[PDB]
Amino acid sequence: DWAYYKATVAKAGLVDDFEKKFNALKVPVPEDKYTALVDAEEQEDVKRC
Amino acid sequence: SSILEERILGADTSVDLEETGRVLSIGDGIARVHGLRNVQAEEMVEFSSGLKGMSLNLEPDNVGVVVFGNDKLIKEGDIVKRTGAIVDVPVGEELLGRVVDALGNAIDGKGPIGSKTRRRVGLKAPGIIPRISVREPMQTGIKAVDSLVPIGRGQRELIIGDRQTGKTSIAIDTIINQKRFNDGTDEKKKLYCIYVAIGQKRSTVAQLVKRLTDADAMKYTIVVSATASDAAPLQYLAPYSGCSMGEYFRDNGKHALIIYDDLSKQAVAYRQMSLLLRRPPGREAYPGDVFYLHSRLLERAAKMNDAFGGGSLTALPVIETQAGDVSAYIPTNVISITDGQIFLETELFYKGIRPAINVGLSVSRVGSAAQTRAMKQVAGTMKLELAQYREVAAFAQFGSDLDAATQQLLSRGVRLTELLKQGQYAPMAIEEQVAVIYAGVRGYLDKLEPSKITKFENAFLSHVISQHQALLGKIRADGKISEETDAKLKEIVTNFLAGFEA
Amino acid sequence: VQKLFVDKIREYRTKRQTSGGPVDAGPEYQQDLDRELFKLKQMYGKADMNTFPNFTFEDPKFEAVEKPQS
Ligand SMILES: Nc1ncnc2c1ncn2[C@@H]1O[C@H](COP(=O)(O)OP(=O)(O)OP(=O)(O)O)[C@@H](O)[C@H]1O
Numbered sequence: 001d002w003a004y005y006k007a008t009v010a011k012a013g014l015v016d017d018f019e020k021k022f023n024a025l026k027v028p029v030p031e032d033k034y035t036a037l038v039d040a041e042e043q044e045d046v047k048r049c
Numbered sequence: 050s051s052i053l054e055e056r057i058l059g060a061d062t063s064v065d066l067e068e069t070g071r072v073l074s075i076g077d078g079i080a081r082v083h084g085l086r087n088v089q090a091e092e093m094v095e096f097s098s099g100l101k102g103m104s105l106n107l108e109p110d111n112v113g114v115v116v117f118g119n120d121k122l123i124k125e126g127d128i129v130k131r132t133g134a135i136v137d138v139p140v141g142e143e144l145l146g147r148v149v150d151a152l153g154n155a156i157d158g159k160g161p162i163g164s165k166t167r168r169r170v171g172l173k174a175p176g177i178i179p180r181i182s183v184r185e186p187m188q189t190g191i192k193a194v195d196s197l198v199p200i201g202r203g204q205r206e207l208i209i210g211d212r213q214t215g216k217t218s219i220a221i222d223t224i225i226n227q228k229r230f231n232d233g234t235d236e237k238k239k240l241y242c243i244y245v246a247i248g249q250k251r252s253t254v255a256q257l258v259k260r261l262t263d264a265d266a267m268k269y270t271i272v273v274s275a276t277a278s279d280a281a282p283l284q285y286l287a288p289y290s291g292c293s294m295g296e297y298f299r300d301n302g303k304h305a306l307i308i309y310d311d312l313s314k315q316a317v318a319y320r321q322m323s324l325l326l327r328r329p330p331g332r333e334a335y336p337g338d339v340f341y342l343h344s345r346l347l348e349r350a351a352k353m354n355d356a357f358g359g360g361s362l363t364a365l366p367v368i369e370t371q372a373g374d375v376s377a378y379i380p381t382n383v384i385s386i387t388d389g390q391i392f393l394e395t396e397l398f399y400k401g402i403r404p405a406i407n408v409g410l411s412v413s414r415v416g417s418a419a420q421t422r423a424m425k426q427v428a429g430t431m432k433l434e435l436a437q438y439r440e441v442a443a444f445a446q447f448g449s450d451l452d453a454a455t456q457q458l459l460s461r462g463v464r465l466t467e468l469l470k471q472g473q474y475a476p477m478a479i480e481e482q483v484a485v486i487y488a489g490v491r492g493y494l495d496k497l498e499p500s501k502i503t504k505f506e507n508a509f510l511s512h513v514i515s516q517h518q519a520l521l522g523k524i525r526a527d528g529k530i531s532e533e534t535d536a537k538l539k540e541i542v543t544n545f546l547a548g549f550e551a
Numbered sequence: 552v553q554k555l556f557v558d559k560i561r562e563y564r565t566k567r568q569t570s571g572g573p574v575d576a577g578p579e580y581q582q583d584l585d586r587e588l589f590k591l592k593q594m595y596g597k598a599d600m601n602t603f604p605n606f607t608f609e610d611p612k613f614e615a616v617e618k619p620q621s
């Protein structure tokens with residue numbers, strides 16, 4: 001809805017260009033830090049089995 | 050700018066002979082006019098400055114006139130003109146989603162309403178032939194209303210109580226809750242709504258349009274508004290104008306709903322307006338026909354037969370009473386016009402029952418019992434299990450112990466009392482109601498604690514909408530709770546109760 | 552009154568000869584349009600013209616559970 005009302009707005013320069021610049025990049029996704037306790041906690045209960 | 054110039058070329062400067070009466074007095078709103086020979090009663094007369102008024106009394110010397118506006122631009126010796134029409138307001142579906150004043154001019158600023166047909170504010174209720182009985186339900190989404198005190202479509206139901214107990218909120222959860230039918234597909238489950246604000250300050254009516262626009266409720270209502278700043282003949286005319294936009298729907302097929310908030314402020318605008326016309330006072334200085342004032346209003350709320358269109362017009366009048374006394378003059382005159390009531394109290398609100406409905410006293414001529422088929426199963430037994438509770442559960446001082454005898458029954462009530470409580474501006478559905486009521490009456494909650502049932506409800510309700518969506522769609526479609534549908538629900542409550550608190 | 556119809560259009564065209572906003576503002580329109588321009592930003596917020604969203608989020612750290620078993 002950024003492109004919708006900026007087209008009907010006439011004051012361009014910082015309007016249609018800001019939606020052109022800030023909407024041309026990638027989504028900052030999260031980090032995958034949960035892998036150590038996935039394997040090391042699991043097999044110690046299966047080895048105790 | 051092109052907009053101002055195009056408004057001035059469309060203006061028509063038509064001139065004709067008027068019919069004209071010189072003013073003899075002006076004080077406190079009443080303008081005794083010399084002249085005005087051929088005037089009708091209840092005709093709309095138009096002052097020189099742009100004001101408007103309605104000639105009530107006819108008399109041989111003078112003509113009594115009350116003003117829709119302000120009486121300071123009017124000086125003795127002015128000119129009163131003749132329109133030639135008994136007082137009428139615009140009507141249509143084109144007013145939908147607006148806030149309007151008591152004569153149909155917009156106070157929201159989205160522009161001129163484009164309306165085509167005009168309808169009087171003094172028309173007549175339909176008689177005995179063109180009605181039919183009440184077949185349909187009107188769902189409020191409150192759980193103490195839909196199960197215990199149901200309301201049909203076409204039935205005048207009175208919400209009565211004190212100040213600050215829930216009378217406006219009850220009638221605004223009802224506005225919100227019809228959102229789910231209005232974006233659906235069939236044209237006979239919708240319910241178009243109307244709110245009439247009489248004697249209310251503008252910092253409540255401009256705040257209620259906010260609550261009705263985040264939930265997108267305002268796309269199917271109208272708000273007729275006569276604030277406390279208005280002239281006393283504008284708070285008198287407001288419910289007769291709001292009810293006449295309701296009868297665009299009802300006299301063309303659809304189903305309407307109308308809330309008068311409230312009708313104890315359409316009476317003190319009649320007591321003042323008709324004391325300055327020198328009419329002799331009755332009881333509490335009210336006029337002779339305050340009963341005729343409310344009765345000619347509350348009988349247009351019809352339910353037409355199916356050879357006229359079959360449309361309905363519910364009505365929900367609000368009444369504020371002083372100190373919770375219901376034997377006053379204006380309460381008892383309007384208890385005996387409505388089919389049923391909803392008695393809101395204060396000691397229910399403060400002990401914790403909110404919405405504070407006295408389910409003992411909230412009687413209702415059930416409206417040919419159009420509750421619905423599945424709710425009849427679970428709230429038929431609920432009605433009796435709660436009635437069994439109230440006869441026996443008022444001691445607060447115990448001396449003897451009969452857990453096999455009495456303490457089993459009163460444990461079924463507190464599980465069904467604390468089930469009946471609700472929040473605010475979040476109204477349920479009917480099959481989400483059948484599920485949560487199933488788990489209360491079938492003994493599946495007597496091993497909880499009553500301080501955890503309000504917590505049990507939202508965890509239950511989120512589990513069934515997420516994981517069991519095809520279950521609830523067979524209750525809403527088939528109407529009834531079938532025996533195989535009784536089978537599937539028997540595990541879900543017990544599977545969830547096996548892992549609720551862990 | 553078509554003689555009045557011409558006389559409010561012809562003094563509307565005179566308003567269409569404009570240089571800098573108001574014709575007779577003086578200290579009136581300059582103060583009012585600046586008092587109102589603050590109030591659309593005062594209780595609303597401090598916002599520039601084109602600055603994008605600049606932030607960073609951190610998720611919940613996944614702790615482990617110690618468990619001697621069997
Ligand atoms: N379902 C509810 N549960 C708990 N509290 C509620 C509920 N509905 C309303 N309230 C609260 O009760 C108070 C009064 O409600 P409301 O304003 O509707 O009463 P009212 O009698 O219409 O007021 P007034 O007398 O000014 O007309 C409000 O503060 C509201 O927040």
Ligand SMILES: [Mg+2]
Pocket residue numbers: 216217310
């Ligand atoms: Mg109220």
